[PDB]
Every structure is written in structure tokens, then in C-alpha cells.
Design a protein around this ligand. Sequence first.
Ligand SMILES: [Zn+2]
Ligand SMILES: [Zn+2]
Ligand SMILES: [Zn+2]
Lengths: 149, 86, 171, 79, 128
Amino acid sequence: MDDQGCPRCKTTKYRNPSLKLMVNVCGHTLCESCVDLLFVRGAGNCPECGTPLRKSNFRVQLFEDPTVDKEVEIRKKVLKIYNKREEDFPSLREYNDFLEEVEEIVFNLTNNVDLDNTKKKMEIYQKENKDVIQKNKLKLTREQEELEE
Amino acid sequence: RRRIETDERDSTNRASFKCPVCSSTFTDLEANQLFDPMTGTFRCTFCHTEVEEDESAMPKKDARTLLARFNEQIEPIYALLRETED
Amino acid sequence: MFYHISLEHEILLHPRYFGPNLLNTVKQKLFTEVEGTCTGKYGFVIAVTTIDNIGAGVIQPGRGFVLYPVKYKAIVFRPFKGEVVDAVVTQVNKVGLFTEIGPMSCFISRHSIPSEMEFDPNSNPPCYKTMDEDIVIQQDDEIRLKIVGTRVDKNDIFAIGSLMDDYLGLV
Amino acid sequence: QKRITTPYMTKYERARVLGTRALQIAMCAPVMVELEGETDPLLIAMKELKARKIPIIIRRYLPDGSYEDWGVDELIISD
Amino acid sequence: EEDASQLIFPKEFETAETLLNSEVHMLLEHRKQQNESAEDEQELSEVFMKTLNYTARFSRFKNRETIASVRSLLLQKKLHKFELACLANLCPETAEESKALIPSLEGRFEDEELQQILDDIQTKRSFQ
Ligand SMILES: [Zn+2]
Ligand SMILES: [Zn+2]
Ligand SMILES: [Zn+2]
């Protein structure tokens, strides 16, 4: 609403707050006026970055900061890992130790390649998918419902 | 803006296949109708001649260049409008 | 999707068939006229299950022919856009893939083929295969495609297919 | 049942019935009656009419939009 | 006007009943026998044969009981006939695939109920 808009169609955004920007894996602001062109050629390629999209991969977002958009999208994904609860650790450092690397991964993934990140995530997934992810999924969804209630 | 949106939507709907004889461009929806298995290639019903497709990149790229610059140059008026909305 | 529906059709019976076996002739003629035909309103009609009713035969003035309106239960097929359907690839080309879906024929444009696919014209049967060689799409194969759109012409229906979505392609 | 029109075949009905039946015979329709040495389809239609065996039903449309389906074998022929 | 992904269909096809390729195969095979019986009658159409070949190749159920079980089972569920036809005709192996293949399927049933239905269908399927 306050921001100019898409690098191409930066005009309707000033008119009304009903129109919302769309986020994509490329972390690029897009909307129907621009999106319609992305389907006629390439069929899912970022205009300036050229990065392909597996599908439409469009989601409604109302944040002017594309880094937050990426960081939130990354956050939401990374929260599926390393999210074991506090009772798992006896030492105070452990409660935020993994959160350090997790926040580094989330932050670094906004700029750096995910090669090492995916490898580490996969190397830990092979271990965490057995029990802690199964248990934390229940506790996370339960506490999420408690947050909603 | 409505005209530009119409021109953008047109840039998305422009036909891709085309006939060099009658200078007619055909949308990809007709591809099954244009492709003749007896010939193994696309042909024009009116001209009974080969129909081309690869040139369809030119209109898509070219139109974007003209339409995009419109918003870039109108910036002073938009700023003056934002400054005069009150 | 395939459907079972009661359809309205009018049989113009020639006077040579009047007299005995009239209705028997209308039944035989109906199957022969409707079975294996297609209409944009209901799609292709595969077979007639039963005939609900034979209306009053109105004699066409001057033509001599008698018009019999018929109500009959038949099975039909019509493809709708934004639908996934099983298909068999008939021909593989660099511009796209031609496939068949029962009575319908579908064309898949190159731009609708996943980026991981690549055309392998040197192969004996022309085919598209993945970079990791895990799946291959060729002629006369089991595939699934998304109907991007449907077309009707010359008493025929033909759809546009896409393989970009997951669970599509070779199955 | 519940028929109000006249039981007699009108001159107009006789004309169209014979013309229509003659046309059907010319188009090689099967013939209802024992014909002997007859070849003119119009002459055959009259024999069928004399015998009241023409296989036609007259849908007499009433002014209120209703109609009465009278079999040719039910009407009294005016000949 | 019409969109299967949105379950939008004309009244002519919305009031109608959907058929599975296993069911159509059985009906076409029956029509075949009905045409094979009383020989010298009209020959079947290429469209019928093409449809028979296609419907047989993709026929997910090869036994009368398997077809009847699938139909009778799905009819009990509070799911639309198009959803049910797509589900039983496409036979998606998982709830995620079913939601991916049928974007309208979401919200009608829980993942456990949806997967349980699919698991039953997968067990009822006839594999060649
Ligand atoms: Zn980007
Ligand atoms: Zn843009
Ligand atoms: Zn031409």
C-alpha cells in the first residue's frame, strides 16, 4: 500500500490496500499484471532473476521487506527440524545452542546457497525423523492450539 | 492502466504458431488441428503450407519492452499525485 | 469423466421401414446412429444401455419421413479443463506429445513438459527422459496429464495436456 | 376417450391422408391392403382408404391448444 | 463457466452420475458379449473398441466384487460423485496425492479418514 510495488507494475499498490503482493521461492514481489506474463513465456521463471518455479508457487503476503518474506518462509520450513522441546536438554546452553545454528541457517539461507544447509538438514533429518520429530510434531501442534486458544 | 492491463493480457494471449503464406498466426490450442501426421508437421488449412512456431518468442519479448517503460517514465506524475492526494 | 445419462434424439425413419418391425427398426437404427458419435454438449457416446421412450411419430410434410423423438440411457465421456486424466502417448515430437484418452486425443506442448525432462531423439522409440533417468515418456505408455483446456470441432473433442504438476507423466 | 371433434373425416383430412399415404407408397413403403394390378401410388392410397387400413393418426388441434389423436380407422370416411 | 478443479460443471453433467473405467470396462465387455451373442448383427464401432482398450488398460478393478465394493463403499461417504469418481478412477496412493490431484478434495475429510478410505481402495484394487 505504501510501497511502490512490483519493479514493473508499481501503480495499483498506491490506489488500494486490497491488492496484496505475492511471494515466491525467488523472493521477488509479483502480482497478476506481472504474473500473467510469466505464464506466457518460461511458465514459472522470475523476470529479473530468471530462476524457475516448479509450480505457480505464489502466496499472499503483506510485508514490504522481501528478506522477511524469505526468512518467514525459511523459518516455517526450518521449524520442522531442531524443534525438540526443552525437557530434552538438562543444560541451559542447550535450550538456545541449536537455536543459534538454526537461526544462522535460516538467516544464511536468505542469501547463501542451501547446499550445506540441505546436507546438514538431511544429515540431521535421518536422525531426528525417528523419534524427536515425531514427538515434537505432537507437542508443537498441541502448543500451537494452546496459542490459538 | 486498464489499456496497459489489456495490452499485457494481449501479450499473454498472442498466438504462437504462424503461416508464412497467408501471414496468419495461430494459437497453440490449434496445434492438434495444424499438425498433420501425414506430413509430420504443422500446416495451414487455407494455404496447405508449413506453419511455423519458434518465432512466437519475438512478440512476447518485444511488447514487454514498450509497456514496461510506461510506468518508469510516469513516475513524476505519480509522485506529484501522491503529493496532491489531499 | 465418463457419465451415464438419458439423451434426447430424433430418428427420421424412411417410409421403406414403416409397417411391421417399425419400432424394432427404430431401435436398431438408433444404436447405429448414436453409438460411436460425439456431441459438444455431452461428449462422445460410447454405448446405449437402454431406451427410455419412443415418442409419437410425426410425419414430416412433403418429406414423407417420420420423425421419432427418442429418450435413451447411454454412457458418455467429456473432458473438462483443470482435470487430470490417464493417457497413452501416440507420437513424441520436439514440439510436443500427441496422446489418446479413450475417444479423445490430447496434445501436450513442450512448454508444459517438466524442466527435468529432455527429448532423446537418438533413442529408437522417440522419448523424453529425466536427467537422472528415473522415468521415461515415450510412445504407447501409461501417463497422466492435466486438461488445460478442451476443444470441440468436426464432431470430435480434443484437449490440451500439461505434465508440470506432480504425479503426472509416466505412471 | 373424451373426444369432442366430429367423427367424420373432413375433406381436408382425406386429401392430406391420401397425399401423405400416396407419397409413402411411392417411397416404397409397405402396403396395407390387397392390391391387384395396381401401380399408381395414389390409386393404391385410395384402396387403402376405402378399406380404412391406412396406418395414420390425425392429430386434430383444438383452438385451446389441446388435441385429439383420431385413428384413420376410427373416422367415418366422407367418400 | 466450467472447471473440474473448482467442481464447476453444467447441470447436464452435474445431475448426471459418474462411471469408473473399471465399471465402463465391465459394461463394455458386457456390451461386447451382447454384441458377440446373436452373430451377424451390426459390428461394434472403433470408438467403442478404442474406449474399451483404453478403459481396460487403465481399469483399476478387474473383479465384479471389487467394482461393487468400491462403489458401494464410496457411496456411503459424504463425498461428491465427482470427487469419488476421481478418487476411485485415479486411485491416488496417498492423501497428499489425492489433494494434489484433486485440489477441491481439501477440507471434506481429515487426513486419517482420507487416508483410511484410500488405503481401503488400494487394498481392494486388482494388480496385474
Ligand atoms: Zn529472487
Ligand atoms: Zn514484475
Ligand atoms: Zn496460411
